[PDB]
Amino acid sequence: GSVNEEARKFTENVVGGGERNRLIYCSNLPFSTAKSDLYDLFETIGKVNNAELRYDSKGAPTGIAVVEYDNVDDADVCIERLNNYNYGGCDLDISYAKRL
Numbered sequence: 704g705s706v707n708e709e710a711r712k713f714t715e716n717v718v719g720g721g722e723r724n725r726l727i728y729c730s731n732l733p734f735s736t737a738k739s740d741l742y743d744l745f746e747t748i749g750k751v752n753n754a755e756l757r758y759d760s761k762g763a764p765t766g767i768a769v770v771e772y773d774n775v776d777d778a779d780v781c782i783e784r785l786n787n788y789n790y791g792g793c794d795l796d797i798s799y800a801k802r803l
Contacts, residue, residue, distance in 0.1 A: 710755055713753065713769055714756070714757035714767065714768070714769050716803040717757075717767075717769055717800050717801070718803070719798040719799075719800070719801070720798045720801065721798065721800055721801030721802075722799065722801065723775055723779075723799055724775060724778075724799055724800070725771055725772050725775045725778060726769065726770075726772075726799065726802065727745075727769065727770045727771075727781050727782075727797060727798070727800055728767075728768075728769055728797075728799070728801070729767070729768040729769070729770060729785070729795060729796065730766060730768075730795075730796045731794065731795055731796045732756070732764070732766045732767065732768055732790070732791070732795065733792060733793045734791075735791055736756060736768065736790075736791070737756070738755060738756055741754050741755075741756060741768055741770070742754055744790065745770045745772070745781065745785065747784075748777050748781045748785070749772065749773060749777040749780065750772060750777060751771065751772065752771050752773060753771035754768065754769065754770040754771060755768065755769055756768045769800055781797055782798060782799070785797045786798070
């Protein structure tokens with residue numbers, strides 16, 4: 704199925720600066736980002752299995768995304784590698800996802 708409540712619950716009740724777990728919360732994304740470009744962006748750390756962009760009214764972006772890496776050690780690379788990178792003219796903000 705192309706669009707599901709799971710994909711919403713993957714960006715809903717999510718906030719940055721969590722305990723160490725394979726899930727990464729990104730913020731300050733440029734407004735032109737798309738899930739296919741987002742997979743290619745975090746794939747240079749190692750490996751994305753589940754990644755997605757939070758939407759506002761329906762399907763319009765927000766500047767927020769979540770990325771599941773293969774393993775918590777790839778998130779530790781991400782937090783020094785993208786947390787610090789100019790994407791679309793924006794210094795991205797990266798951390799472990801605390802999903803409530």
